[model samples]
Target chain A: RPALYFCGSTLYERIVSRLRRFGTVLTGDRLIHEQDLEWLQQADVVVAEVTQPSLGVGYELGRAVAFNKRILCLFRPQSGRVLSAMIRGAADGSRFQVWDYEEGEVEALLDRYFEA
Target chain B: GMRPALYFCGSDRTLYERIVSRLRRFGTVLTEHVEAAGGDRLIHEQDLEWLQQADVVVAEVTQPSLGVGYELGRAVAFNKRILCLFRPQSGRVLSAMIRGAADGSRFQVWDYEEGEVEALLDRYFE
Candidate 1:
């Protein structure tokens, strides 16, 4: 099973706990404080919750892209409204798969990531 | 002495007023009026002309405003110093394309605070 790096705030603890049932879950704050860049560098895949993107999270995403890491961004519905035009442009509908945070969305998204 | 000029680009009249009032203490400010440009309108050619003449440009990018993004791009292409003020609590983090464009130089980000704004002014003008 591939490890999943979760990038989000403390508010996402519930979602993190839920994802743990699928694979190893590593939170961004823990990784940041521990200076564990290795986890990101060595992870097989990254699942980022960009519902309310943070500077630190953005920086991490950039690093992940630079390292050619496969990234799966999870954006809750209507979350794109808070994004800047530049941000929206980069994450344009075609770039990454976005999923609403409800129902059986996580399992379906996880399946898609694994297949890809 | 570098006299910084600030420009407020947003459709929210309340936000425009607040920014203008606070920035007045620092330097001259130019803002769009609803009667003329109306709300949520892209910048006109006349506004672009004024922006080109400014030594520095400060923009509020809290919302997903296309006009704000256009102005920022124009300023970058024109070589004008740029400052982006965003509400970290409410605004979205910049995307990869913007980060790539602003990676080395020519732009910066700040929170909604007087101190951070002042610090940036000092760095740019001093």
Candidate 2:
């Protein structure tokens, strides 16, 4: 099983739960700063929900990039917010990718991302 | 003099320049490629080097920039002192990740007016 560090606003807790089937998911809600960093260092990949613009997620993504961990950022276009160019532009289709997903399509997106 | 790297989104280029001018009083700041006409692989590599070298990071967060957010993440991991400046005008809200993580000990978030920024810089440097 792939060790994955999942990050996002708590509003998307359902997505975190859903991600469990794909891999061993770790989140920051219950972990302290030290523990969170430790998991991030150990995780094989980083999956983030970027719809809400959490600085913590951005931070994690930055650290992930530094750590050279493959990163997948999921965004929903229905949110009416423009994705930051930094995140949008960072997608090189290899180390980083941003998927604009809709309501019920998250699992399929994750499936393809994880499989690829 | 401290080695502080200033990070901002390109949308706020003028703001970034003004900040660079002010922060220069305290020490040399690393603002490389922040306003470049174009960015390629080398810019990313150079910026990462600067991020690693800076002793402190001062970022303008009024406008959302993925690059700034990423740099802040690395700054936290690098254990550098971080001060994020946010302008509350136009009813824009700062990201909760930044607003919430500010414990006043390492990471800090400040809402500021144009004139008030110097005081904050002085406080930060002091």
Candidate 3:
């Protein structure tokens, strides 16, 4: 199972089901906030949905970077909702990829992302 | 008389030192970006302590840095008043979390970039 770090309550609101096809999703939802850091530290890779901005999520992303993990940040391409430039900076540096899609495209994206 | 003290935060890389200097005219700035401060730093523990005592928060949100985002969230939790400044025409998108929270109630946001920032501060924090 792919150990993944999922944050925020909107985990399954969209492409979560797609993640299960590849592996069980691990999350820091129930643990103490600092404990969440450990969970992300041990994770294999990370996929965060940046559509909703939460500083906690941003914190987790920072930890993921510290551990040198590849990140996949997902966002729904809604009009007027701007994705933060910090996440974009990481992508520009070749650390993560930002994907925008609707519905089932997430699974396909995951499939492609994990195609190694 | 003490003007309202503010915890001013912005991306040191994205925003310039000269612009941030304008804040001194508005109120006391509790924290300064470490890079701007000659490698001296408050240490995170020190930063957290100031977050509570500060009268208000002033943040620049044009870029997306998690640390900056985290600070904004923490400030909200502490119930400090806030204002987020972003240059909408800067061609960079703001995070939904930052943009969403600006629903025009708890805090204020100025997408506007014109005139002296001091002018905006005078009117806004007035």
Candidate 4:
């Protein structure tokens, strides 16, 4: 199984729990800050929720970009928040992709992402 | 009038002191311990708190540092007005993600050199 590093706000802990079916998941709370970076370096893929603003999540995305890790950034329009253009505008649609997802749609998205 | 709470973060340690010192005159520089020694968790928690509390974030991106990138990401997400200073003469290229985010409103990226930081600050905070 691929080691997927999951990042998002504390409010979305539910999504983190659901990520387990995809692979071994590591998150900010699960490791020290330094260890988080180390895990990002080791992770085969990165998944982030950019719906609610979280600095930790943004930082992880930046590092994933630097490390050239394949990243899937998910934003929910239902949250009534717009994703940052730094993320939305910069996506090249290959190494990086931004998807708009809602309730009950995460599993299919992950399945499609993992299959590629 | 109350001074804005400012936070500074970047990968370039050499410019940390200089940038913070300059910014001190404009506002309360919340990131005083850029060189703080500690466990990563404490450092991360402390900085994140400061960033959350800050009204503005100034970052030097002349050197690409993952930590700086992270902090900038947080600053953007937090809705703080941000100024990213870069030195084009350094020959180091900036990431497209950052380069693309320079919207000239909430997020800005300025090409600056020695002694130009304060002027940018003056204009940004004006």
Cα-based lDDT at residue A33, candidate 2: 54
Return the clash pairs for model 1, or none.
Answer: none
Instruction: Write the residue-wise lDDT of candidate 2 on B1-126 in tens digits.
Output: 445454433335566677777787776677634533134444666666787877678888876656677778777777888888898984777766667557877788889976677777788777
List ranges where model 3 is wrong by over 4 Å.
A1-56, A59-116, B12-19, B33-42, B114-116
lDDT of 4 by residue, B85-107 (tens): 88898997765556666677888
Candidate 2 Cα errors over 4 Å, as ranges: A10-14, A28-32, A77-80, B1-18, B32-46, B62-65, B86-106, B110-114
Q: Please tell me which model should have the higher TM-score, number 2 or number 3.
A: 2
Residues B1-126, candidate 3, lDDT per residue (tens digit)? 887677877753534454457777777788765422221123444665787788888887776555567567667667778788888777877655566556465567788674556677777766
DockQ of each: 0.04, 0.33, 0.11, 0.09
**What range of 10 consecutive residues in model 3 chain A has the weakest lDDT sum?**
A27-36
Candidate 1, residues B16-124: lDDT per residue as tens digits?
5666666666676765342222321233445666777776677766654434554665565567777666666664664433343453355766656533555555554
Candidate 2 local lDDT, A17-104, one digit each (tens): 7778778998833236557768889998898888876556777788787778888889899999776656775778788978899868
Q: Each prediction's TM-score against the native?
A: 0.46, 0.72, 0.51, 0.53
Where does model 4 exceed 4 Å of error? A1-116, B12-14, B35-38
Residue A26's lDDT within candidate 4 is 84
Complex DockQ, candidate 1 = 0.04
CA error at residue A38 for candidate 3, angstroms: 24
Instruction: Single out the weakest 10-residue window by summed lDDT for candidate 1 chain B.
Output: B34-43
Cand. 1 TM to true fold: 0.46
What lDDT is obtained when candidate 2 is compared to the true structure?
0.73
